[PDB]
Design a protein around this ligand. Structure first.
Ligand code: CL
Ligand code: CL
Ligand code: CL
Ligand code: CL
Ligand code: CL
Ligand code: CL
Ligand code: CL
Ligand code: CL
Ligand code: CL
Ligand code: CL
Ligand code: CL
Ligand code: CL
Ligand code: CL
Ligand code: CL
Ligand code: CL
Ligand code: CL
Ligand code: CL
Ligand code: CL
Ligand code: CL
Ligand code: CL
Ligand code: CL
Ligand code: CL
Ligand code: CL
Ligand code: CL
Ligand code: CL
Ligand code: CL
Ligand code: CL
Ligand code: CL
Ligand code: CL
Ligand code: CL
Ligand code: CL
Ligand code: CL
Ligand code: CL
Ligand code: CL
Ligand code: CL
Ligand code: CL
Ligand code: CL
Ligand code: CL
Ligand code: CL
Ligand code: CL
Ligand code: CL
Ligand code: CL
Ligand code: CL
Ligand code: CL
Ligand code: CL
Ligand code: CL
Ligand code: CL
Ligand code: CL
Ligand code: CL
Ligand code: CL
Ligand code: CL
Ligand code: CL
Ligand code: CL
Ligand code: CL
Ligand code: CL
Ligand code: CL
Ligand code: CL
Ligand code: CL
Ligand code: CL
Ligand code: CL
Ligand code: CL
Ligand code: CL
Ligand code: CL
Ligand code: CL
Ligand code: CL
Ligand code: CL
Ligand code: CL
Ligand code: CL
Ligand code: CL
Ligand code: CL
Ligand code: CL
Ligand code: CL
Ligand code: CL
Ligand code: CL
Ligand code: CL
Ligand code: CL
Ligand code: CL
Ligand code: CL
Ligand code: CL
Ligand code: CL
Ligand code: CL
Ligand code: CL
Ligand code: CL
Ligand code: CL
Ligand code: CL
Ligand code: CL
Ligand code: CL
Ligand code: CL
Ligand code: CL
Ligand code: CL
Ligand code: CL
Ligand code: CL
Ligand code: CL
Ligand code: CL
Ligand code: CL
Ligand code: CL
Ligand code: CL
Ligand code: CL
Ligand code: CL
Ligand code: CL
Ligand code: CL
Ligand code: CL
Ligand code: CL
Ligand code: CL
Ligand code: CL
Ligand code: CL
Ligand code: CL
Ligand code: CL
Ligand code: CL
Ligand code: CL
Ligand code: CL
Ligand code: CL
Ligand code: CL
Ligand code: CL
Ligand code: CL
Ligand code: CL
Ligand code: CL
Ligand code: CL
Ligand code: CL
Ligand code: CL
Ligand code: CL
Ligand code: CL
Ligand code: CL
Ligand code: CL
Ligand code: CL
Ligand code: CL
Ligand code: FE
Ligand code: FE
Ligand code: FE
Ligand code: FE
Ligand code: FE
Ligand code: FE
Ligand code: FE
Ligand code: FE
Ligand code: FE
Ligand code: FE
Ligand code: FE
Ligand code: FE
Ligand code: FE
Ligand code: FE
Ligand code: FE
Ligand code: FE
Ligand code: FE
Ligand code: FE
Ligand code: FE
Ligand code: FE
Ligand code: FE
Ligand code: FE
Ligand code: FE
Ligand code: FE
Ligand code: FE
Ligand code: FE
Ligand code: FE
Ligand code: FE
Ligand code: FE
Ligand code: FE
Ligand code: FE
Ligand code: FE
Ligand code: NA
Ligand code: NA
Ligand code: NA
Ligand code: NA
Ligand code: NA
Ligand code: NA
Ligand code: NA
Ligand code: NA
Ligand code: NA
Ligand code: NA
Ligand code: NA
Ligand code: NA
Ligand code: NA
Ligand code: NA
Ligand code: NA
Ligand code: NA
Ligand code: NA
Ligand code: NA
Ligand code: NA
Ligand code: NA
Ligand code: NA
Ligand code: NA
Ligand code: NA
Ligand code: NA
Ligand code: NA
Ligand code: NA
Ligand code: NA
Ligand code: NA
Ligand code: NA
Ligand code: NA
Ligand code: NA
Ligand code: NA
Ligand code: NA
Ligand code: NA
Ligand code: NA
Ligand code: NA
Ligand code: NA
Ligand code: NA
Ligand code: NA
Ligand code: NA
Ligand code: NA
Ligand code: NA
Ligand code: NA
Ligand code: NA
Ligand code: NA
Ligand code: NA
Ligand code: NA
Ligand code: NA
Ligand code: NA
Ligand code: NA
Ligand code: NA
Ligand code: NA
Ligand code: NA
Ligand code: NA
Ligand code: NA
Ligand code: NA
Ligand code: NA
Ligand code: NA
Ligand code: NA
Ligand code: NA
Ligand code: NA
Ligand code: NA
Ligand code: NA
Ligand code: NA
Ligand code: NA
Ligand code: NA
Ligand code: NA
Ligand code: NA
Ligand code: NA
Ligand code: NA
Ligand code: NA
Ligand code: NA
Ligand code: NA
Ligand code: NA
Ligand code: NA
Ligand code: NA
Ligand code: NA
Ligand code: NA
Ligand code: NA
Ligand code: NA
Ligand code: NA
Ligand code: NA
Ligand code: NA
Ligand code: NA
Ligand code: NA
Ligand code: NA
Ligand code: NA
Ligand code: NA
Ligand code: NA
Ligand code: NA
Ligand code: NA
Ligand code: NA
Ligand code: NA
Ligand code: NA
Ligand code: NA
Ligand code: NA
Ligand code: NA
Ligand code: NA
Ligand code: NA
Ligand code: NA
Ligand code: NA
Ligand code: NA
Lengths: 168, 168, 168, 168, 168, 168
């Protein structure tokens, strides 16, 4: 490939892994969104919030695909595994699972940064810092505060009202 | 579920199958799009066309997910299998594979319609006719004409110029 | 009648039945609306929601009357029976009765479609699909989610707040 | 009921009677409207005029329902009887029947006023004067002039042209 | 043809037949239009109405031609036979012939729908319902009411005035 | 007919012949247009150009129909014969056939002018000069230059690009 320069095969593989991981997170959120749109669950704020979250994760995957081609790597796709659950429970349960997901993705991003630092790839490090690491910190902090407020609001009416407040 | 009415368990399963099939088609197009954005392939019209195609297929999946919940079914997700190839060849090869994909999806939609007619589900039949069957016919006709023009244009310069003309 | 063509006397009678059924549903909702505007009930969201529902059902009747004349049938009116109750209970009770009403109307629409398919009346089938079957599916799904949220909110304050949120 | 004051049980019953009577008049006009939209009758001015008349009568019913609840009465619904005829004849015949209907409704309104005066209910009397008695006088005078002009115009062409002039 | 799928040779032939039938109806209306523009007939409303009708029928043919190519059929043209008459008589005579024409075309459309249902072609059925069957019902009802009003208006002055009112 | 003056029966017949000839040319172009919209031909510029040409020829027929009635002749319709071919070959073949058609129509227009000069019908001559003869000269010159450029461009890519340039 005429464009490849200072791009190590381990970094290329790490990017292909993160691409799969972002699509996976996209799929989880899709599943959460459809769970909260069940007639017997019917939390329209959660639905909209997880649908938007699913769409954002697809963007994160797509920016990595682009990055792979910009640097002269080869994108290699794997299966996008189905999420661990078919039903995500209450809005509190789902938000806990979402926190776990974002932290898992955050840890993979930090391993990917560590890979790029290790192979002296400053452009890859900056790409990751600039587009992913601060976004991850905000999302985790965001979900964590929701969890605190879901426990403050309590079940029943509290969950209905916390749900109203989700998107604004 | 308090909303379910005249919605047969075979139709619900058929919808879950089509949901997987639309995501799969989405993933194929994503792969085609990244293939045409390689520095050693570099056909920006194809890239944009398959990226838009991938996004449309995700919408088709999402309208089916919605339909499942509107009718009081339960969405059940499966793995989204990786596409058959890592490299899609020339713009002519990819467009042939895309035609094959759209016809495979079209046949599944026609089996799904047949399932809804068989179980006397007129609302499901109309949903499928209204949002999917004509859209499929247009897309197949569209790709077929591209194939005819790719063979008319020939390889090399013809492929470059046919690619310019793709999106408009 | 100079316009009648491929319009079977059983279909004409079925349309006259559905006309009565839509007016009946209109009258139920009128009664629900006046129940929630009692000084000792005083749920203004419910009032407005059932008043709008009553008006929509009158439109559904009127489109069928039109359809009867477009196809060269004769509209034949019957009494519009009074609703089963004078008092509809809590917002949860009324919404349950409304779900039952919409499902009863939906079943009559599906019998009417079955009548038109049976007599090979494709124009009548499409009319019913296009203007009634999807609208019915949305309304039933809508009311069902309200029921789920009314049970989540609980009685007292929950009912007051759920009522605020009804129309938006 | 915490709001009821100087509202006699005979007046409440009289209002429930008038509510039924306004819906009945609504239903008559609905039937007239569908009669003039038959392919073998086809007088589009009459159709539109009786459709608007039917809608106005529904408003008159709905203002009375409101009045019942404002005064702390209980609305009690009865069956809305079907109209006396399935076919209303010429535009002259229908307009004669409409005059008879409006005069019957007017006499019921005047009995209702007499009931409210008798029970010393000045607010109810004013409500009736303000929203119903002058409106009734205008409608009766209006229909009567139409009858005079329908007899002046004569049958055939006169009826076609008088019909053009109905709504403006 | 690379696009053809679930499109039976009998349906393709049925579409070619309907294409001829729509052009034929176009030609009839062209002839009616020129009849009412004769100096010795001179009914400018009829002229304009049949000229617009002729143009609409050409559109109906052209949408079918398109449909044939979208589905991967081959359009096959036949002669467009001249209309049965050179002179169409009074506005009442022409409108009767137009009613007969529209009903003949409507019956062919219903046979074509029956052909597509029989060969399990849901996309073709919906195409026909969506673009043709309701349009046919409206046109037949429309012409029938004109016939009723032409008989109400009578010959001479009535015909002149009914003609004024045709287009609006 | 009260308007006829200096309008010879041979000229009236000549106009009826040209009316048939313009409709025939309309039908040829319709067939060419549908040929270039086949999935296995797929030249969208040609399609649009022949569809517009077909529509223009219908206008030419319609202005002659009008002229017949303005002069107090009687329009007499004949069958519109189907075109000589079902398939028109390459864009070069079709354009050659179109040149032949326009020259055939041009020769008929010049015979018609000769008929009107011969019968001392200056108004008919001017009508033909003003609306037809220069339009014919432009169209023939136009198609001829296309033929020259189609031979310059060559088959394959040249045909694709010449087709892009057709309408602008
Ligand atoms: Cl290195
Ligand atoms: Cl659950
Ligand atoms: Cl988010
Ligand atoms: Cl990027
Ligand atoms: Cl790039
Ligand atoms: Cl792979
Ligand atoms: Cl996993
Ligand atoms: Cl799995
Ligand atoms: Cl759980
Ligand atoms: Cl859990
Ligand atoms: Cl969890
Ligand atoms: Cl991790
Ligand atoms: Cl490191
Ligand atoms: Cl590090
Ligand atoms: Cl490392
Ligand atoms: Cl290092
Ligand atoms: Cl990001
Ligand atoms: Cl944040
Ligand atoms: Cl920040
Ligand atoms: Cl927060
Ligand atoms: Cl809860
Ligand atoms: Cl069933
Ligand atoms: Cl390659
Ligand atoms: Cl697309
Ligand atoms: Cl949907
Ligand atoms: Cl929904
Ligand atoms: Cl699963
Ligand atoms: Cl697979
Ligand atoms: Cl796999
Ligand atoms: Cl390959
Ligand atoms: Cl290949
Ligand atoms: Cl392939
Ligand atoms: Cl398949
Ligand atoms: Cl079936
Ligand atoms: Cl089937
Ligand atoms: Cl089946
Ligand atoms: Cl069945
Ligand atoms: Cl779709
Ligand atoms: Cl298309
Ligand atoms: Cl289409
Ligand atoms: Cl094309
Ligand atoms: Cl190439
Ligand atoms: Cl029948
Ligand atoms: Cl109560
Ligand atoms: Cl509603
Ligand atoms: Cl209707
Ligand atoms: Cl109508
Ligand atoms: Cl009756
Ligand atoms: Cl009942
Ligand atoms: Cl009763
Ligand atoms: Cl109760
Ligand atoms: Cl109850
Ligand atoms: Cl109940
Ligand atoms: Cl029922
Ligand atoms: Cl049936
Ligand atoms: Cl059925
Ligand atoms: Cl049945
Ligand atoms: Cl049957
Ligand atoms: Cl509806
Ligand atoms: Cl809904
Ligand atoms: Cl919907
Ligand atoms: Cl809800
Ligand atoms: Cl309560
Ligand atoms: Cl008192
Ligand atoms: Cl009658
Ligand atoms: Cl009025
Ligand atoms: Cl009031
Ligand atoms: Cl109030
Ligand atoms: Cl009662
Ligand atoms: Cl009565
Ligand atoms: Cl009765
Ligand atoms: Cl009578
Ligand atoms: Cl009478
Ligand atoms: Cl009477
Ligand atoms: Cl009375
Ligand atoms: Cl009194
Ligand atoms: Cl008095
Ligand atoms: Cl009294
Ligand atoms: Cl008194
Ligand atoms: Cl009033
Ligand atoms: Cl007045
Ligand atoms: Cl006044
Ligand atoms: Cl008057
Ligand atoms: Cl009359
Ligand atoms: Cl088949
Ligand atoms: Cl004549
Ligand atoms: Cl029309
Ligand atoms: Cl089409
Ligand atoms: Cl197309
Ligand atoms: Cl042929
Ligand atoms: Cl014939
Ligand atoms: Cl013939
Ligand atoms: Cl005749
Ligand atoms: Cl005749
Ligand atoms: Cl006739
Ligand atoms: Cl027929
Ligand atoms: Cl059939
Ligand atoms: Cl059938
Ligand atoms: Cl058949
Ligand atoms: Cl079959
Ligand atoms: Cl149509
Ligand atoms: Cl109509
Ligand atoms: Cl309609
Ligand atoms: Cl009419
Ligand atoms: Cl006459
Ligand atoms: Cl002469
Ligand atoms: Cl060919
Ligand atoms: Cl042209
Ligand atoms: Cl002219
Ligand atoms: Cl003129
Ligand atoms: Cl003839
Ligand atoms: Cl010929
Ligand atoms: Cl022939
Ligand atoms: Cl050829
Ligand atoms: Cl040739
Ligand atoms: Cl040739
Ligand atoms: Cl010639
Ligand atoms: Cl000469
Ligand atoms: Cl000469
Ligand atoms: Cl000569
Ligand atoms: Cl001479
Ligand atoms: Cl011209
Ligand atoms: Cl030119
Ligand atoms: Cl010029
Ligand atoms: Cl040129
Ligand atoms: Cl070529
Ligand atoms: Fe490198
Ligand atoms: Fe992410
Ligand atoms: Fe919950
Ligand atoms: Fe650093
Ligand atoms: Fe996120
Ligand atoms: Fe069911
Ligand atoms: Fe799709
Ligand atoms: Fe290539
Ligand atoms: Fe349909
Ligand atoms: Fe259908
Ligand atoms: Fe539709
Ligand atoms: Fe597609
Ligand atoms: Fe019939
Ligand atoms: Fe309804
Ligand atoms: Fe309550
Ligand atoms: Fe409803
Ligand atoms: Fe009192
Ligand atoms: Fe009234
Ligand atoms: Fe009459
Ligand atoms: Fe009135
Ligand atoms: Fe086939
Ligand atoms: Fe037509
Ligand atoms: Fe006449
Ligand atoms: Fe069907
Ligand atoms: Fe028509
Ligand atoms: Fe003469
Ligand atoms: Fe011409
Ligand atoms: Fe060619
Ligand atoms: Fe001149
Ligand atoms: Fe001259
Ligand atoms: Fe001039
Ligand atoms: Fe031309
Ligand atoms: Na690197
Ligand atoms: Na990897
Ligand atoms: Na690698
Ligand atoms: Na890899
Ligand atoms: Na991308
Ligand atoms: Na991108
Ligand atoms: Na890329
Ligand atoms: Na970059
Ligand atoms: Na690089
Ligand atoms: Na990989
Ligand atoms: Na899994
Ligand atoms: Na960690
Ligand atoms: Na790190
Ligand atoms: Na990693
Ligand atoms: Na390194
Ligand atoms: Na933050
Ligand atoms: Na909560
Ligand atoms: Na079903
Ligand atoms: Na399934
Ligand atoms: Na199932
Ligand atoms: Na399933
Ligand atoms: Na969705
Ligand atoms: Na959605
Ligand atoms: Na959903
Ligand atoms: Na739906
Ligand atoms: Na359902
Ligand atoms: Na599944
Ligand atoms: Na695979
Ligand atoms: Na197939
Ligand atoms: Na099917
Ligand atoms: Na299927
Ligand atoms: Na079934
Ligand atoms: Na198309
Ligand atoms: Na090519
Ligand atoms: Na029928
Ligand atoms: Na009945
Ligand atoms: Na009947
Ligand atoms: Na009946
Ligand atoms: Na109506
Ligand atoms: Na109406
Ligand atoms: Na009607
Ligand atoms: Na209709
Ligand atoms: Na009919
Ligand atoms: Na009845
Ligand atoms: Na009852
Ligand atoms: Na049922
Ligand atoms: Na049914
Ligand atoms: Na029924
Ligand atoms: Na039948
Ligand atoms: Na819905
Ligand atoms: Na509640
Ligand atoms: Na009183
Ligand atoms: Na009473
Ligand atoms: Na009382
Ligand atoms: Na009472
Ligand atoms: Na009211
Ligand atoms: Na009101
Ligand atoms: Na009220
Ligand atoms: Na009041
Ligand atoms: Na009171
Ligand atoms: Na009562
Ligand atoms: Na009665
Ligand atoms: Na009286
Ligand atoms: Na009085
Ligand atoms: Na009274
Ligand atoms: Na009293
Ligand atoms: Na007055
Ligand atoms: Na009259
Ligand atoms: Na077929
Ligand atoms: Na045929
Ligand atoms: Na065939
Ligand atoms: Na054929
Ligand atoms: Na066309
Ligand atoms: Na077209
Ligand atoms: Na076409
Ligand atoms: Na189509
Ligand atoms: Na096809
Ligand atoms: Na044919
Ligand atoms: Na003939
Ligand atoms: Na028939
Ligand atoms: Na049929
Ligand atoms: Na047919
Ligand atoms: Na078949
Ligand atoms: Na109509
Ligand atoms: Na007349
Ligand atoms: Na002459
Ligand atoms: Na001739
Ligand atoms: Na002659
Ligand atoms: Na002649
Ligand atoms: Na003309
Ligand atoms: Na004209
Ligand atoms: Na003319
Ligand atoms: Na002239
Ligand atoms: Na003349
Ligand atoms: Na002739
Ligand atoms: Na021929
Ligand atoms: Na010549
Ligand atoms: Na000449
Ligand atoms: Na000539
Ligand atoms: Na002469
Ligand atoms: Na020129
Ligand atoms: Na060429």
């Amino acid at each position: 490939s005429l464009c490849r320069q200072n791009y190590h095969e381990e970094c290329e593989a790490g990017v292909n892994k993160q691409i799969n991981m972002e699509f996976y997170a996209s799929y989880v959120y899709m599943s959460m969104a459809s769970h909260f749109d069940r007639d017997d669950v019917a939390l329209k704020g959660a639905h909209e919030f997880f649908l938007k979250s699913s769409s954002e994760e697809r963007e994160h995957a797509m920016r990595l695909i682009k990055f792979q081609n910009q640097r002269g790597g080869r994108v290699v796709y794997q299966d996008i595994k189905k999420p661990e659950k078919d039903a995500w429970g209450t809005l509190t349960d789902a938000m806990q699972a979402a926190l776990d997901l974002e932290k898992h993705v955050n840890q993979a991003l930090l391993d990917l940064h560590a890979l790029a630092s290790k192979h002296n790839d400053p452009q890859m490090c900056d790409f990751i810092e600039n587009h992913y690491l601060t976004e991850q910190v905000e999302a985790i902090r965001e979900i964590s505060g929701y969890l605190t407020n879901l426990k403050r609001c309590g079940p029943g009416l509290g969950e209905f009202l916390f749900d109203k407040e989700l998107n604004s």
